[PDB]
Amino acid sequence: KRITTPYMTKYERARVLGTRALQIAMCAPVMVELEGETDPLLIAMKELKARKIPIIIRRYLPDGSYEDWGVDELIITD
Amino acid sequence: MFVLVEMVDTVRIPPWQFERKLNDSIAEELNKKLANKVVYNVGLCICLFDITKLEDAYVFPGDGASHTKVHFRCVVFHPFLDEILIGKIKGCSPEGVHVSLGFFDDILIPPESLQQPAKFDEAEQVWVWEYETEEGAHDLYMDTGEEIRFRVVDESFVDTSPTGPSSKEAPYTLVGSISEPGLGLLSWW
Amino acid sequence: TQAEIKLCSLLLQEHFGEIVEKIGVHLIRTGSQPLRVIAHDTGTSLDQVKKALCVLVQHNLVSYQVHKRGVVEYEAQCSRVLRMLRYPRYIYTTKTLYSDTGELIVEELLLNGKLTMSAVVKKVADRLTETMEDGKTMDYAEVSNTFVRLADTHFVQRCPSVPTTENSDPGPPPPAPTLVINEKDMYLVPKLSLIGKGKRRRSSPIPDDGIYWQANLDRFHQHFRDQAIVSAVANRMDQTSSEIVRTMLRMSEITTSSSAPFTQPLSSNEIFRSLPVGYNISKQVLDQYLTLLADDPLEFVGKSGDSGGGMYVINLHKALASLATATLESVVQERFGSRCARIFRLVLQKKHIEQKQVEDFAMIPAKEAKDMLYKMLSENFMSLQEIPKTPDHAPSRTFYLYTVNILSAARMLLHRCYKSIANLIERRQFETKENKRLLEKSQRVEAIIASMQATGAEEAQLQEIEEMITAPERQQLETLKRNVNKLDASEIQVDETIFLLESYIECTMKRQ
Amino acid sequence: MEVKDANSALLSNYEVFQLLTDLKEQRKESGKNKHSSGQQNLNTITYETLKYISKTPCRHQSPEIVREFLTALKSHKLTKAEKLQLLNHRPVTAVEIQLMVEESEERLTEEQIEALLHTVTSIL
Amino acid sequence: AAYTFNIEAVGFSKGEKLPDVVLKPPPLFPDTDYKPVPLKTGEGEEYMLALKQELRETMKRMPYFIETPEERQDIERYSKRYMKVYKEEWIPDWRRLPREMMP
Amino acid sequence: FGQKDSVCGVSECIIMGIPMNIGTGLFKLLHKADRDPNPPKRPLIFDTNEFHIPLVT
C-alpha cells in the first residue's frame, strides 16, 4: 500500500507541467488532439486536464523508501 | 577470439523517439555508441548482443530526454594470450610485418619472433626467409597479403588521449609471434 | 616516518604477501587498534584479518595488551619490521662465529619466528642431510651441543612465557593469556634425551612444549657494535692494539648493558691473561698501549681508575659519536668532493665560524667556499645561528654563525638511507615485473633441462633449447641477473650505514 | 559506462556469424541521416567483421553441429580454449594441432592426435 | 620593466649584470660530477648476496606466506597446473595467541 | 583539518548550480515508456556448463 497524500501537490503539478512542456517543445508525440495551440505549456496543461501525461512521480520518503504514483491516478485540483 | 562483456551504461533516449518501443531504441542507441571503438580494458566492441536488465527511465532536470540504466552484454574482439589467428598482410616495415585481421589493423610481428634462419632484409622493404634446398633467400612476404597464420603473445593498452592543454597511436596494439613450427603463411605447411 | 612506512610496506609485501602487508601497514600507520577496527578501516574479510594477525604475531612483529572492559589492542613494531632487512648479515655472522649447524639454527629461527628446541634441532638435522652423503646421517646431539653454545653466548633466547593458570587466577579464561617475560629462564635450556636421525626426503608427547625460542637481535647488535669499534681501532692504530680492544670488548660482553654510557672497568692484570696465546707481548708494553690509547683525543678508552695498577674502561657513546661523525663526513666527501669535506670538518671542529674565517682557515678561495657552504645548507648538513643585535632579527644587522650539529644531520642521513633502500627495492621489482615473461620462459626451459637430467639425458635436447628462441634473449637474462644481483648487493651494503647511524641515534636518547 | 565482467563467456565464431546475419536482416530499411558518425561506424564494423568471418571455416555450421562436436570432443581431456580454437579453425593436418594444444607431444599420443583429426573432420 | 621591490635593496648598485633570462627549463636529470664508490666484494660479502636470494625463494614457499588468490583469470591452461603448488598449512599455538584469533 | 562540507544544504546548492531539495526538487520524475524489463536472453550455444567439465582433477 501507499501511505502518502493522494492529492497532487503544487510542486508536483509545476514540475510535471514543466517536464511535459519541455518534451512537447522538443519533438515528442502529443497525447491529446491539439487545436492550433502553439505555446507548449498550454498543450501540457490540456494534457493534464484530460489525464494523459506519461509521467510517473517517484516520491522519496527521507529514509530511502519510495512510492511510485502515476500522474493519471493523482487527484489534481485548482 | 570473441567474448561477452557484461557492461552497464546510461543511455540518453531523446524525446522524439518515444513512439517506439524502448528495447529497440536502447539497442539502436548503444550500437550507435559502442560500435567500432576500443574500450580501454576489454577490447574492441563489435556490436550489441542482448539487453539483460533495463531499469527505470528517469528524467533529469533541465533536459526532457529520458535517461535509463541498461544492463547489457556486448561481443568484443579480445583474443586471449597464446591464440592462433589467420589474417592478411598489409605491408612490411623496418619494425616488422604489419598484419591486418580484416576489421582490425594493428597486429605487429617483431623481428625477434620471425622464423630464425633469416631475420634481415637487404635494405628492401619486404621481409624474407631462407631455406637451403628450395627458395634460398628469395622467399618473401608479399604486400598483396596472402593469408598467414600467427600466434598472439602480447597485447597492450595505451590510453590515447590529448596529452597537453586543449579545448594518434593505436589504443589497442597487439603483438604476435610466428616463430613456432607450422605457422607463417598457409602456403608453407 | 613516511620513508619507514614505505620500506616496511615493501619488506612485508616481499616476505609475507599482500593481505598481510595491508594489516601490517595499517598497524604501523595508525597505531594501537582493536581487532574489529583493523577489519573495518581496511575493508577485508575477518578471517583474513585473523590469519594476518596470527602470522604477524608469530614472527614477533605485532604485540598485544589487555585494556579496560576486556579488549585486545594490537600494535606493530616498526623497528622490528625494519630489522627484517639485516637477516643475511645475521646468518653470515653466525656462520662466522660458529659452524654450519649454528648457521642453520639461526636460519630456522629467523624464518619460522618462534620454534621449540625439539622442532629446530629436528629441522636442522633434516636439512644437514643434503649437505652430506654416503650413508652418514646427522644426529640430534651435536646439533643440541651447538644450540646450547648459542644459548650460552645469548644469541638465541627464549620467548616470553605463558603464566601457570592453575596458580594464576583459576576459573574463566581471559581473552588474552597475558604473556610475561621472565628474566630467570631466558637461557636455561630444557634437557633432552631424545636422539634420532634425519630423513633423506624419500617421499615413500613433547617435553619442552610451549618453550619457544627466538633470535635475540639485541645481542647481534651488540656484536656488530663491537666489530665496528674494533675495525675503527684496527684502521687507526695497529693490529695488536685492535686485538687488545677486541679482548676488552670480549670481557665486556657478558657483564654490562647493551645501552650503557660506560661499561665495567677492567684491570690490566686480567687484560694480560685474557689474550689468546699467539701474541708475544709483555705487561709493560700492554701498559704502554693502554696509556697511549688513553692519549688519543678520539678517546675510545678512559682511565676511570687507579687501584690494581692499570685500570681501564672502553667508551661506548664517544666511540659511536666518532663512528657517526666519520659516516656523516664520508657521505659529504663522496657527494660534493674533498674540498667541501674540508669545509665540513672545519665547521665541525671549530664549533662556530663565519665566512671570512672559513676562507682564511681552509685555503679555499671565494666563489668556491661559499658555494660549498650554501650547497651544504641546502641539504640540512649545516645549520645557521643568527646572533641578533636588535629583536627585529633582520639580516642586515646580525652575524651568521655556521654550525654542524651531528644529531640532526645523522637523523637526516638515516631518513635518506631508508628512502634509498626503498628506491633500490622499487627498481628491482620493476625489472622483474617487466621481464617476468622471459623469466617464466626460462623457468620452463630449465624445468625441461631439469627433468630426466640424471637418466636418459641426450645431448640433442641441449641443442634444442639453444635452437629455441630463448638464445637471443639469454643476453637479456644475463643483464637482468646481473642487475638484480647488483641491486640486492647494494640493498645489503646500505645497512652498514644504517646500523652505524641507528646506534648513535639510539644511544643519544634517554627514554624517561 | 562500467564493466562488471571483462571476461564473461567465450564465443565460437558461429555465434558471431549468426548475430551479424540477424543484424543484417533488419538493417538498411532507413538509411543514414548524416546527424552523427555512429551509423557509419556501425555499418563499417558490422560489414567488415562479417566479411572476415565469411572466409573462415565457421560458415556452413549450425547449432546442432556445435552440439555434437562438443559432445564427441567431451571425452578427450582438453580445455575450453583449445576446444574453441579447434571449433573455429577446422584443422586438417597434425602440424597445427601441435600448435593449438599445449604440450601436444606430452599429453596426446600420436594415435590420439590422429583420432582427434578424425573427430574434427567427421563432424564439421 | 620596473619592479614592486627596489632592486637596490636586493643589490646591483651598479645596476648591471642581472641574472640571465632562462629560455628552456633545466633537464630532469642533471649531470653529476661524481659517481658512486664501487661495491665491496669478497668471499664473505658474496655469501650474503646468495643467502638473500635464498630467503626470497624459501619464504615464498613457506606456509607463513599467505598466498593471494588468483582473480578473474581468462582461460584455464594446461601450463597453469605447472604453476599451482599445493602447500601444507601451519597451525598456530593457540595458547600464546588470544581467544579472538580462533576462526 | 580537511573537513568535508556537504552540498546538501540549500545555499551551497544554489552556489554549486545543482537543483535543491526543497520545493520542486524533493521528488524524481520517471518516464512511462513502453518498455519490457528482463527481456528474453539470446542463448549461448558454445559455452554452457554441461559441455565443459573442467580438466584438472
Place of cell 644469541: C155
CA distance B123 to chain D (A): 33
What counts of helices (H) and strands (E) characterise chain F?
A: 1, 1
What is the DSSP pairing of strand B66-77 with strand B83-87?
unpaired
Closest CA to C263 of C339, C185, C201, C315: C315
Beta bridge partners of F50: none
Closest partner residue to D78 (CB to CB) among F42, F44, F55 is F55
Q: Does F35 touch chain B (CB under 8 A)?
A: yes
Classified as helix, coil or strand, C9 is helix
* A4, A45, E103 from A53: Cα distances, Å: 21, 10, 59
Residue of E nearest to D101 (CA): E78
Domain around A49: 1-78
Q: Which DSSP string do the residues of C218-263 spell out, in sequence order?
A: HHHHHHHHHHHHHHHHHHHT-HHHHHHHHHHHHHHTTTS-SS-SB-
Q: Residue C322: which H helix or E strand, with range?
A: helix C317-336
Residue C162: all three cell numbers together: 605463558
Dihedral sign computed on CA atoms, order F6, F8, F9, F10? positive
Taking the mean position of all CA atoms in its chain, how far away is CA B176? 13
Residue of E nearest to B79 (CA): E74
CATH-assigned architecture of domain C319-407: Orthogonal Bundle (1.10)
Do C182 and C134 form a contact (C-beta atoms < 8 A)?
A: no
Classified as helix, coil or strand, B115 is coil
**D5, D7, D13, D15, best to mutate vs chain F, most F CBs in 10 Å:** D15
Do B82 and B90 form a contact (C-beta atoms < 8 A)?
A: no
Classified as helix, coil or strand, B143 is coil
Q: Residue D11: which H helix or E strand, with range?
A: strand D2-11
The letter for the amino acid at C104 is L
**D2, D8, D24, best to mutate vs chain B, most B CBs in 10 Å:** D8
Chain breaks in chain B (C to N over 2.5 A) after: 167
CA distance E22 to chain B (A): 22
Q: Do chains A and E touch (3 or more CB pairs under 8 A)?
A: no
Residue C150: all three cell numbers together: 648459542
Q: What are the b/e assignments for C418-453, b being 16+ CB within 10 Å?
A: bebbbebbeebeebeeebeeebeebeebeeeeeeee
Number of structural domains in chain B: 2
Give the whole-angstrom CA distance, residue C447 versus residue B102: 39
Give the whole-angstrom CA distance, residue E36 versus residue A40: 80
**D79, D85, D106, D108, best to mutate vs chain E, most E CBs in 10 Å:** D79
Give the whole-angstrom CA distance, residue A23 versus residue A30: 9
Q: CA C118, C123, C129 angle in degrees (round to 5)?
A: 130
Give the whole-angstrom CA distance, residue F21 versus residue F10: 7
List of chains touching E (3+ CB pairs within 8 A): B, C, D, F
* C406, C408, C414, C502 from C417: Cα distances, Å: 16, 14, 5, 11
Closest CA to B147 of B113, B106, B188: B188
**B13, B18, B21, best to mutate vs chain A, most A CBs in 10 Å:** B18
Q: Do chains E and F touch (3 or more CB pairs under 8 A)?
A: yes
Contact (CB<8Å) E81/F56: yes
Long-range pairs, B28-32, Cβ under 8 A, ≥24? B30/B70, B30/B72, B30/B74, B31/D38, B31/D42, B32/D36, B32/D38, B32/D39, B32/D42
* C130, C138, C195 from C134: Cα distances, Å: 11, 12, 21
What is the SS3 assignment for C347-376?
HHHCCCECHHHHHHHCCCCCCCHHHHHHHH
The fold adopted by the segment(s) C219-318 is Arc Repressor Mutant, subunit A (1.10.10)
| Chain E residues touching D7 at Cβ < 8 A | 72, 74
Q: Residue B172: which H helix or E strand, with range?
A: strand B172-177
Dihedral sign computed on CA atoms, order A41, A46, A48, A54? negative
Resolution limit, Å: 3.3
Contact (CB<8Å) B41/D88: no
**F27, F35, F45, best to mutate vs chain B, most B CBs in 10 Å:** F35
Closest CA to C94 of C84, C102, C86, C85: C102
Count Cα neighbours of C388 within 13 Å in the Cβ-side half-sphere. Answer: 6
Give the whole-angstrom CA distance, residue B172 versus residue B157: 5
Return all residues near D68 (Cβ < 8 A) that are at least 6 apart. Answer: D123
Do C50 and C91 form a contact (C-beta atoms < 8 A)?
A: no
Burial tier of C38 (Cβ tally within 10 Å: 0-12, 13-18, 19+): buried
Residue E2: all three cell numbers together: 620596473
Classified as helix, coil or strand, C410 is helix
| Chain B residues touching E74 at Cβ < 8 A | 80-81
Give the whole-angstrom CA distance, residue D123 versus residue D63: 12
Do B145 and B89 form a contact (C-beta atoms < 8 A)?
A: yes
Closest CA to C346 of C360, C367, C327: C360
From B47, B79, B111, give the residue that closes a domain: B79
Number of neighbouring beta carbons within 10 Å of residue B142: 11
Residues in E 19-78 with any Cβ partner in F closer than 8 A: 76, 78
CA distance E23 to chain C (A): 24
Give the whole-angstrom CA distance, residue C128 versus residue E14: 83
Number of neighbouring beta carbons within 10 Å of residue C136: 9
Classified as helix, coil or strand, C495 is helix
Taking the mean position of all CA atoms in its chain, how far away is CA C103? 16
Give the whole-angstrom CA distance, residue C156 versus residue C94: 11
Number of structural domains in chain A: 1
Give the whole-angstrom CA distance, residue B92 versus residue B115: 15
Closest CA to C323 of C298, C350, C349: C298
Contact (CB<8Å) C88/E95: no
Q: Where are the beta strands (DSSP E) in B14-123?
A: 37-39, 43-59, 66-77, 83-87, 89-92, 97-101, 104-109
Do B21 and B74 form a contact (C-beta atoms < 8 A)?
A: no
Strands of C301-302's sheet, edge to edge?
Answer: C266-267, C311-314, C301-302
CA distance E62 to chain F (A): 24
Q: CA B109, B114, B120 angle in degrees (round to 5)?
A: 105
Phi-psi region of B96 (alpha: psi -120 to 50; beta: other; left: phi over 0): left
Beta bridge partners of B157: B172
Q: CA A68, A69, A73 angle in degrees (round to 5)?
A: 155
Give the whole-angstrom CA distance, residue C7 versus residue C425: 9
Closest CA to A52 of A72, A68, A29: A72
* A68, B89, C321, C345, C370 from C328: Cα distances, Å: 75, 64, 10, 10, 20
Instruction: For C47, list phi and psi in degrees, rounded to 5.
Output: -65, -35
Contact (CB<8Å) F28/A70: no
Closest partner residue to B18 (CB to CB) among F33, F37, F39 is F33
Place of cell 600466434: B151
Contact (CB<8Å) E78/D10: no
List of chains touching C (3+ CB pairs within 8 A): B, E
What is the SS3 assignment for chain E?
CCCCCCHHHHCCCCCCCCCCCCCCCCCCCCCCCCCCCCCCCCCCHHHHHHHHHHHHHHHCCCCCCCCCCCCCCCCCCCCCCCCCCCCCCCCCCCCCCCHHHCC
Contact (CB<8Å) D66/F55: no
Number of neighbouring beta carbons within 10 Å of residue C166: 7
Q: B170 and B87, same structural domain? A: yes
Closest partner residue to E79 (CB to CB) among D7, D10, D102 is D102
Q: Do chains F and C touch (3 or more CB pairs under 8 A)?
A: no
Closest CA to C90 of C110, C72, C71: C110
Closest partner residue to E76 (CB to CB) among D5, D79, D103 is D79
Classified as helix, coil or strand, D2 is strand
Place of cell 591486418: B100
Give the whole-angstrom CA distance, residue F48 versus residue D81: 13
Q: Where are the beta strands (DSSP E) in C37-86?
A: 62-66, 72-76
C-alpha torsion angle, residues C481, C482, C486, C492 (rounded to 10): 40
- Max CA-CA distance within chain D? 61
| Chain B residues touching D38 at Cβ < 8 A | 31-33, 35
Q: B118 and B31, same structural domain? A: no
What counts of helices (H) and strands (E) characterise chain C?
A: 22, 9
Taking the mean position of all CA atoms in its chain, how far away is CA D65? 12
Q: Residue C78: which H helix or E strand, with range?
A: helix C78-82
Closest partner residue to B103 (CB to CB) among D5, D8, D49 is D49
Q: B107 and B42, same structural domain? A: no
CA distance E84 to chain F (A): 11
Give the whole-angstrom CA distance, residue B118 versus residue B140: 11
Do B124 and B57 form a contact (C-beta atoms < 8 A)?
A: no
Over its C-alpha atoms, chain C yields an Rg (Å, rounded) of 28
Give the whole-angstrom CA distance, residue C396 versus residue C388: 10
Domain around B105: 80-189
User: Would you give the DSSP letter of residue B49?
Assistant: E
Q: Does F28 touch chain B (CB under 8 A)?
A: yes
Return all residues near C467 (Cβ < 8 A) that are at least 6 apart. Answer: none
| Chain A residues touching B56 at Cβ < 8 A | 58
Burial tier of A18 (Cβ tally within 10 Å: 0-12, 13-18, 19+): middle
From B79, B101, B133, give the residue that closes a domain: B79
Q: Does E78 touch chain D (CB under 8 A)?
A: yes
| Chain B residues touching A17 at Cβ < 8 A | none
Beta bridge partners of B4: B75, D9
Q: B103 and B53, same structural domain? A: no
* A54, B20, F30 from F33: Cα distances, Å: 8, 9, 9
Closest CA to C314 of C233, C395, C391: C233
Classified as helix, coil or strand, C23 is helix
Return all residues near C468 (Cβ < 8 A) that are at least 6 apart. Answer: C445
Q: Any alpha helices (H) in B130-185, and if so which ranges?
A: none
Q: Which DSSP string do the residues of A15-60 spell out, in sequence order?
A: HHHHHHHHHHHTTPPPSS---S--SHHHHHHHHHHTT---EEEEEE
Closest CA to B97 of B105, B83, B87, B107: B107
Beta bridge partners of C46: none
Closest CA to D77 of D48, D103, D57: D103
| Chain B residues touching A25 at Cβ < 8 A | 64
The letter for the amino acid at C280 is N
What is the SS3 assignment for C281-309?
CCHHHHHHHHHHHCCCCCCCEECCCCCCC
Closest partner residue to A28 (CB to CB) among B15, B56, B63 is B15
Beta bridge partners of B98: B91, B108
Classified as helix, coil or strand, D55 is coil
List of chains touching A (3+ CB pairs within 8 A): B, F
Contact (CB<8Å) A56/F23: no
Give the whole-angstrom CA distance, residue C404 versus residue C349: 9
Place of cell 547449432: D63
Q: What are the b/e assignments for C390-402, b being 16+ CB within 10 Å?
A: eeeeeeeeeeebb
| Chain F residues touching E81 at Cβ < 8 A | 56
The letter for the amino acid at C211 is I
* A56, C456, E92 from A69: Cα distances, Å: 6, 83, 60
Q: B185 and B155, same structural domain? A: yes
Q: Does E30 touch chain C (CB under 8 A)?
A: no
Residue B7: all three cell numbers together: 557492461
What is the DSSP pairing of strand B172-177 with strand B89-92?
unpaired
Give the whole-angstrom CA distance, residue B150 versus residue B82: 10
Beta bridge partners of B177: B151
Place of cell 623496418: B94
From B27, B56, B79, give the residue that closes a domain: B79
Residue B99: all three cell numbers together: 598484419
Instruction: For B33, list phi and psi in degrees, rounded to 5.
Output: -120, -30
| Chain C residues touching B113 at Cβ < 8 A | 469
Number of neighbouring beta carbons within 10 Å of residue D95: 13
Contact (CB<8Å) A70/F26: no
Give the whole-angstrom CA distance, residue C21 versus residue E66: 10
Q: Residue D16: which H helix or E strand, with range?
A: helix D13-25
Give the whole-angstrom CA distance, residue C149 versus residue B52: 73
Q: Do chains D and A touch (3 or more CB pairs under 8 A)?
A: no
CATH-assigned architecture of domain C2-82: Orthogonal Bundle (1.10)
